[PDB]
Structures are given as C-alpha cells and as structure tokens.
Design a binder for this molecule. Structure first.
Ligand SMILES: CCCCCCCC(=O)SCCNC(=O)CCNC(=O)[C@H](O)C(C)(C)COP(=O)(O)OP(=O)(O)OC[C@H]1O[C@@H](n2cnc3c(N)ncnc32)[C@H](O)[C@@H]1OP(=O)(O)O
Lengths: 63, 62, 62
C-alpha cells in the first residue's frame, strides 16, 4: 500500500502459486527497509547521512 | 393516473410517504441504525459529527 | 585490446549495445515490464507519473 508496489507475487494469491516462489513473498525493498528499521539508532549521533547502497542481492525469498 | 403534485418538500414527504430533499426531519436522540424496520419513519435523520480532511487522509486512502 | 571509445552517450550506447547515461530513449507507448526478453531493447525507457512527498509519507514509512 505505502510504496505502491502492487506486483503479482505480493498482492495476488493465485498468480503467486503459479510463480517461481510457490506462494506470496515479502517485498525485497521491505526486507531492505525493515533491516534499517532494526539496525539504525534513532538518537542524534555521529551518523549523518545514508549516502547510497553498494551491492544488494536477494538470495532466498522471505514469506 | 399520473399526477404532478406541486408543493413544499415537507409536504411532498407526507404525500409520498417518503423523504424528499428539504423536508422536515425527526431527530430523536438515538441512532436510526438502532431502530427496527417497523419503527423507522421516512424522515428519521441523523446529523453526524465532523471529520477534517487532511493531506494525510488523501495519502493513506491513495 | 582495451580501447577507450569516446563520443556522445547516444553513440556509446549503440556501440556497446547497452544504454549508458545520456543516450536517446525508445518510449513506445506500452510498459517495458510487459515485454519479453527478446523484445526488450537496451534503451526501452519509461517516464512514470509523479508522486508528491509529504510529511505523512515520512511518518508512515518511519
Ligand atoms: C521492484 C523492481 C523489480 C520488479 C519485480 C519485483 C519482484 C519482487 O518483488 S520479488 C521480491 C522478493 N525477492 C526475492 O524473493 C528474490 C528471490 N531470490 C532469487 O534471486 C532467487 O534465488 C531466484 C530463484 C529468483 C534466482 O536465483 P538463482 O539464479 O536461481 O540462484 P542464486 O544462487 O540465487 O544465484 C543468483 C544470484 O544470487 C547471488 N547469491 C546466491 N547465493 C549467494 C550467497 N551465499 N552469497 C552472496 N550472494 C549469493 C549470486 O551473487 C547471484 O548473483 P550474480 O548475478 O552476481 O551471480
């Protein structure tokens, strides 16, 4: 909903059964966003900016 | 017989046994969804509370 | 042989059989995610609709 990414492997139950994944899988960008939800300090510190991302690969699907 | 009945909407409501657009209302301190079918009268009204439309409402609904 | 090919990016794109950074685009009225592998050309572009970032977007994503 929030991102706007309504891809069939995430929002369809029928086509996700016909896909390579077998059922509906979590968005890769939500794994990437919830990760930064897990490791980022909320407080003011030495960390300033995000500056980019080096090399991302999604290996196994998250259900 | 097809008859064009002219008059005020609060009169056309009583003639037609319905509610029209500008007829008088029967606001009676309890909710019209609490009433059964036999105690609903055509004209049983409800002035709801308000809700301010914001940009966050547009974003969350979109 | 390592050759440093110069020229315009729309020329380097056709030399390298890729799309590089400032090359011309092939916008062809249907979405490139509908095309199969053999009909995707390097250069098949897409100009998406916009989206206004608001404070509610930051709140909902945080
Ligand atoms: C949003 C923009 C895209 C629009 C479409 C959106 C589609 C989605 O949202 S899907 C969202 C969830 N994402 C996923 O589930 C991704 C699924 N994971 C995969 O990539 C699957 O393995 C699959 C089957 C699709 C392809 O993988 P497959 O080629 O069969 O085998 P695999 O072992 O993974 O090797 C491929 C890549 O994985 C990487 N990899 C695999 N194992 C490892 C490992 N242990 N360490 C590091 N990298 C690894 C490799 O680097 C390789 O990349 P490269 O091109 O550099 O060689």
């Amino acid at each position: 909903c929030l991102s706007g990414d309504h891809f069939y492997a995430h929002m369809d139950k029928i086509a996700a059964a016909e896909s390579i994944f077998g059922e509906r899988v979590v968005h890769g960008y939500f794994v990437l966003s919830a990760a930064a939800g897990l490791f980022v300090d909320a407080g003011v510190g030495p960390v300033i900016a995000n500056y980019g991302l080096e090399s991302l690969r999604f290996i196994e699907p998250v259900k | 017989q097809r008859t064009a009945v002219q008059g005020s909407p609060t009169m056309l409501a009583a003639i037609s046994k319905q509610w029209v657009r500008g007829a008088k209302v029967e606001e009676d301190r309890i909710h019209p969804f609490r009433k059964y079918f036999e105690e609903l009268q055509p004209g049983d009204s409800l002035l709801t509370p308000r809700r301010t439309m914001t940009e966050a409402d547009i974003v969350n609904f979109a």
